[PDB]
Amino acid sequence: NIAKIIIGPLIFVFLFSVVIGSIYLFLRKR
């Protein structure tokens, strides 16, 4: 297999997790 193939979902879930996750903190912030 290739590493890139793994980077695809790895970066998609990683980047997305951070983005969406950021809201979890923002909402708490006041």
Swiss-Prot record:
It comes from the Eukaryota. The chain crosses the membrane at residues 5-27. This is Insulin receptor subunit beta. It comes from Homo sapiens. The gene is INSR. The chain holds residues 953 to 982 of 1382 of the full protein.
